Amino acid sequence: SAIKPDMKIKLRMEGNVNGHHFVIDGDGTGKPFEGKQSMDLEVKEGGPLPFAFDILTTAFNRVFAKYPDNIQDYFKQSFPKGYSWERSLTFEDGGICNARNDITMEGDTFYNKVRFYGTNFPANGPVMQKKTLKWEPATEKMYVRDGVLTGDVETALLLEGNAHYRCDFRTTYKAKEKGVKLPGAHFVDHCIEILSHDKDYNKVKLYEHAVAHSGLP
């Protein structure tokens, strides 16, 4: 396999949320076969961010997902040429985000060209007031729609004061090489956590664990 057990991650995100521009660099490592990755993020422009860092974290690669033998692993089969994804995030208070990542590989390193655009967050809402605590663990439903691998998530951020803030995600995934075979319908469970950060989330250590499964025992 082109994909080694230990891989490096280099990332640049450029984005705009409610008109605030930012550039964030990431450096990390992961274990594709164990579905684990960790990365150090550093805000390079636009800091301190005037919105909840949590809305960005799912944009900071389903190659870091433990896939069993009985499910086609589209993501690992996409290398070395790579793949990209496009995602819409719809929040319950009208906030909308569009994100994309183009993922390439050179030697032992995944390179990520990430774009993140968010609009329509109410100024008095939990995102612009920085009242988010974390993403709850979530399940991504994977299926092919009209020849395109699609992942749906229905989830929520936990807020201060025992409240939840609902978000629906739809991601479409496309391999760069024609003829990478599409998988059957399946689930990917993930957990995403900010392990540590400094005062205004200028530096953030991010961790994610993901496991693909078929639903039953």
Author numbering: 2 to 61, 65 to 221
What text does the study give?
At pH 5.5 we see a striking difference in the photoswitching behavior. The unilluminated structure shows the cis chromophore, while illumination with 405 nm light accumulates the trans state with high yields. However, at pH 5.5 we observe that the OFF state is identified as the cationic chromophore with additional protonation of the imidazolinone nitrogen which is concurrent with a newly formed hydrogen bond with the Glu212 carboxylate side chain. Excitation of the neutral-cis with 400 nm light causes a bleach in the 389 nm peak and a + 7 nm redshift assigned to the formation of a cationic-trans chromophore. Under the illuminated condition, we observe difference spectra peaks at 1713 and 1692 cm–1 at pH 5.5 and at 1710 and 1690 cm–1 at p2H 5.5 which we assign to the C=O stretch of the cationic-trans chromophore. The DED of the trans structures at pH 8.4 and 5.5 indicate movement of His194 and Glu212 and show significant negative density close to the N4 and C=O of the imidazolinone ring. The Glu212 carboxyl oxygen to imidazolinone-ring nitrogen (N4) distance is reduced from 3.76 Å at pH 8.4 to 2.54 Å at pH 5.5. We interpret this rearrangement as the formation of a H-bond which is made favorable by protonation of the chromophore. We therefore conclude that the majority of trans chromophore structural changes between pH 8.4 and 5.5 are due to the formation a cationic-trans chromophore compared to the neutral. At acidic pH, this isomerization occurs reversibly with a change in protonation state to a trans-cation chromophore state, a new class of reaction not previously observed in rsFPs.
